[PDB]
Amino acid sequence: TRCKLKLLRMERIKDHLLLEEEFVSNSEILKPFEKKQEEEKKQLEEIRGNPLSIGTLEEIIDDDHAIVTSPTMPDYYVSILSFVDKELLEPGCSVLLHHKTMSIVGVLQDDADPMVSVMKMDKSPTESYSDIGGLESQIQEIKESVELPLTHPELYEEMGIKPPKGVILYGAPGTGKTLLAKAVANQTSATFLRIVGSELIQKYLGDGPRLCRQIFKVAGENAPSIVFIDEIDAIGTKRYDSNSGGEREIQRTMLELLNQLDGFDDRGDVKVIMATNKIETLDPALIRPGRIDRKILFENPDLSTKKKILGIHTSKMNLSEDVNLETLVTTKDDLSGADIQAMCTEAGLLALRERRMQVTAEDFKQAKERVMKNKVEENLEGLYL
Amino acid sequence: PRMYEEASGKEVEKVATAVLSTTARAKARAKKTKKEKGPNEEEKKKEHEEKEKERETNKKGIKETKENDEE
Amino acid sequence: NVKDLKASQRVCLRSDSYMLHKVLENKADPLVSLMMVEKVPDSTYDMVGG
Amino acid sequence: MVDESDKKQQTIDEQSQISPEKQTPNKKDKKKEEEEQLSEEDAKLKTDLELLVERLKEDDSSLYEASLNALKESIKNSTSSMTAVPKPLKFLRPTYPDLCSIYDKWTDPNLKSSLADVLSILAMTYSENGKHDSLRYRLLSDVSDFEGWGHEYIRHLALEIGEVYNDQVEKDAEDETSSDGSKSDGSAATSGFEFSKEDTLRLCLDIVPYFLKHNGEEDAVDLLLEIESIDKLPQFVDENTFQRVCQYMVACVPLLPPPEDVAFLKTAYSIYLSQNELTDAIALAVRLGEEDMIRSVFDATSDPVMHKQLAYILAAQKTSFEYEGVQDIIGNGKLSEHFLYLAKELNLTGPKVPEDIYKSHLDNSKSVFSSAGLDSAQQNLASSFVNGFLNLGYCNDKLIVDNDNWVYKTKGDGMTSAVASIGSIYQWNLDGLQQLDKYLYVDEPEVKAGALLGIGISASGVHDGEVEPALLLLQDYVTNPDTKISSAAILGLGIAFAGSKNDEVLGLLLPIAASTDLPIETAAMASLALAHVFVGTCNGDITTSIMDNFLERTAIELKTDWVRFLALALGILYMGQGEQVDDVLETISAIEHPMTSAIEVLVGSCAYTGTGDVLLIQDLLHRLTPKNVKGEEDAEIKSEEKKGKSSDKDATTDGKNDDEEEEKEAGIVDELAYAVLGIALIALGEDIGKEMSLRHFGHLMHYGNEHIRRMVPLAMGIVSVSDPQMKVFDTLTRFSHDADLEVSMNSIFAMGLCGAGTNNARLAQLLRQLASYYSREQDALFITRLAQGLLHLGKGTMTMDVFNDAHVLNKVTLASILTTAVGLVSPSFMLKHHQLFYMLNAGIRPKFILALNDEGEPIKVNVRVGQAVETVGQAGRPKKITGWITQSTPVLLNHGERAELETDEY
Amino acid sequence: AAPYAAKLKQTENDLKDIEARIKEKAGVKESDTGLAPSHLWDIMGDRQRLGEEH
Ligand SMILES: Nc1ncnc2c1ncn2[C@@H]1O[C@H](COP(=O)(O)OP(=O)(O)OP(=O)(O)O)[C@@H](O)[C@H]1O
Ligand SMILES: [Mg+2]
Asked: Would you say D568 and D602 are in contact if contact means Cβ atoms under 8 Å apart?
């Protein structure tokens, strides 16, 4: 009771003050200036018409022009002029054009696009510094590769080695490979990119290779970063369709991904994470070792590892005096970490079933037998016996 | 002719919103603030005298002025 | 205002300048129109007893 | 479910869910029919109890509500509570859940309000007997298994919290209040509370903090002692008990404001003193500010023992931990008298033993020489300071100094700072004095003056055990009539003695600070030194220090620059207190001058601390005031106006800094948000205001010692290439110094880039160069903190020379000050009885997981680290002692303390 | 249920306050694109934009 009040003491006053502070300041900003900056703004608005057609800058020719490719079907030789500089632009950046006669009138985007919006996230990570136990060892391998160059680059220099680039998490479902990456990201306090690899692909053609570029482009602006491209399996060796409407799309999109990962330089400052079911849903060579270090094979919790996962859950639920910690383990045979969480959800539903406010002995025992029954084989001991 | 200046009423309006909002925001912390406070006032003074504090001041209720003119 | 328009707000526009009208909370997609086709859920557990 | 009669016992329960027989009907009819049938009712009480229990397992509210509804009527309608006194009184046992069934089980507003008052009354009256306490208790420990019992006993306890609070507000007190009709006094509710307290600490924790704080009395706290001292060995171990006591103390820092806190820390001390961690006793004794309390823990271990034993050794260690050196004074002397061991003890108490252990770290680390040794113009001046700045702490750079060429080639006020930088090479080491003595007895007075500052810096390494007092040497110089020499002498003397108000030191600085009639811009150091000295114990808020700033204004008010530096010195004096600092705001405000008003707004930041959430709304009222006043009006002097404005800006930030360390520790993260958007507002708002705020950011983060040091330096830095005052870069680096090449990796390049890339003035430049070299330490040799370390609720004491320079436009004069940056965290290595000079293992966790403590306790598992390293500042700011897995046991707790450990291996 | 119940609603209001705080913040961003060396580019800028030449 006393400490949840202390969270309230810290959060209510500081946070409530912060809203109020923003709200007055929006007025207050205006008042210091009354000419010069106001004037320049005023003529920016006369110059720039309403609406503005979006552009994408392909390239700058150094003579006060450029070439843009726009969602308007023909391309344009546009000029660079009015409240924009030649060096305020870089190629491949998104520009704002004048409706009447296309001209770069400045930038207020700088790689602002919807695919950027999905990718950047302001969400809170689900796990923070391995909240849920088990897989102690595997995290002390992600950390060596990913977290460790960011935190201390010096140690690699004494060693005289180049620092790693990226990790590949793979193997079993229900082992929380996608959640360890979230843990590592919160530990450092890095920039995290939840983009999903499957969100670049659509029926419509020719859109995809833009999207692959934009990932590497944004990641480098906000570096240091951790990039997670989750579920790069779907864009693997496989094909969209066996008829039509996708013969090209997977082929261009994957190839284009390998290229801009290597083309950065061999960096140890923008890490990638590829989350994949297996290497049998991807191409047999990726990009392909010395360059992609390290590879982490997830396999099923062992008796030690699954104990650890379980102890977390059971303590957050009523009672444990009824059926010993050991007696849960003993009854269970080795399975993924989802099966361990599943037994506890079912146990809780069973306490509801009885209409108890205690997880009784009976509830534990049934919940254990249920999961084992899904998920079953018996010809391991049938070949034998 | 009417009043054709209201520029300085913006300044009134801005600082009215500042002080009132913090006041509201503070209420949680404000509870314990009163316990701390009352003793130091006993030690020193209320605001200029050690008398007219044998109750809250000397009246539970309050003085309000209300004008019911309508002409 | 730009304090009255929010991120991910659907809006109406003209077509001769694309000048805004007003805010809309009805978001129109084929999946949302699929709910219009389906209509209301029906029936009761004792109709499907046993 | 429904009516099913009396066939077996199961079915009696199902019948009374609809309409009882032996409960509501029977008793009610009996009591209003005859008044001799009350003896039959008495037996029928037991029968009711078991049926109540049986039907306290049904989750639906309606079929217990309606059933016993009419019992609620009966309280006052038939029983009437006075027909035969004990008998009606004791039949209010079924009636108390019945009230709660409408209260909590049923959520209907009208009824919830009305029956709250009644429940309080009937509780109180029936606790006289004590069977109402026992009624609460069968629900506290349960007799049923369902949802119902899990809320009802909790509802009782809130009833109590409501009434007690209402007596505070109400000026009638007792039951002459109209809140409930009830009192928190007498013999009827007091005894209810007494019983209540006993049980709930033992088993729960729920009503326990609300009683304590509401009373506001150290008595209530002394009841808490009695219950806890029982619990410490047979019901949970020793270790678990240590965690309880400090959870209570760290948690309630922003739940006990100053006057409130002082009566409480007294009880907390006693708890610790009884207990086996005397380390906790002493740690807590610093809080109180009481010398007396520190002295008591030492006398308790020393005097009733006639042997070295554990006792003498532990005493040295506890006192050693503060780098205040206040504890150093107390602790040495008694050792001299007793005559155990002189050689182990005096050194271990004093800062002498931290020198040996640094040697082993240094040996590994080598000495990196990347400094420039440029000559001509300002480049001469830049390079000679950077050399000191790159070998801070005990490091070797000796051979370079021994070539006295580049040293002597400086001139002016630079010359003075060049002799000074040399001393910081051998900072916190006995030696240092050798390099300095040579310069001090030859050439211009400038070089003599600079020597004195260095002797001061080196002398932080030995100034206790009654051995090598700075006073003996530095006195002769104060005596000398020249201004440069005398100022230097008394500044350096403050640094060496640190937080000690040793008599000789103090008493030299007492006649002076009272002639500042003479206009000397380099006479700051008179009050600046006394401020450094004061902090470490409860502040005097001495009247000499307040007087002389006003004398300065009488003589001269043409040179503002001096009077701005003085004003800061007074507020820094007053840190480590808050109770007493309320009085002095009034002393300054007595005199009215526009100049004096400048003084008031600074010192206000120090006065209102520890209820600093009020301080925040005030430092915002500050922002608004220039503009608001201007609005109304629309529809010699120069010095006074400029001091006016600037002080305000300075205060706004100072205000924040003081607040964030002492109350919150977790909350610092949020407060950092408060600062960045605050800083933007001032930087945009006034131009003149923007200069103060640029430097202030670097020291804001350092005072709070942030948990996230990744984002904030680096963002400000890019922006500040455009922004003027390149001193901006120096202040970010003083924070970034931290844990090297985590915070510092981006930083060294960024700061080197701006200076090297473009030279737009040799003036702007000099700062740009100084910054890069300044951050670095060779191999993570020491860290820096603007904190005690012992407590992270505390504050610095040797770091205040650092802290001072952020209100100041850049200058040669300023350089002189900056050579000092004493207050370095000693590495928290493991010691034996015959001395060990390295660690074994530690747990690190980058951010602690606990929210019962926020001092720096993480879990037992941590992430395992090796030996031979300084205390990490990012990725291992809290540090825990790892022992549960290694079958080996530490004696001395560590929670990101400065404190060295000691372990017993079996 | 008073220890957690009351404190649950208090938790909730803070989060909602934080969501609202972010929509106040993002409706105003950093001013504008105006730069003194490209204010001189404006002299030529009016003529070419209105002309038929790009
Ligand atoms: N080391 C660990 N970190 C995180 N959770 C873990 C860990 N070990 C086991 N778990 C358990 O595994 C559970 C399942 O995780 P989750 O279902 O997200 O799996 P995944 O391997 O990322 O899957 P998918 O193939 O479905 O994308 C967690 O909820 C948790 O109970
Ligand atoms: Mg996954």
From this structure: yes
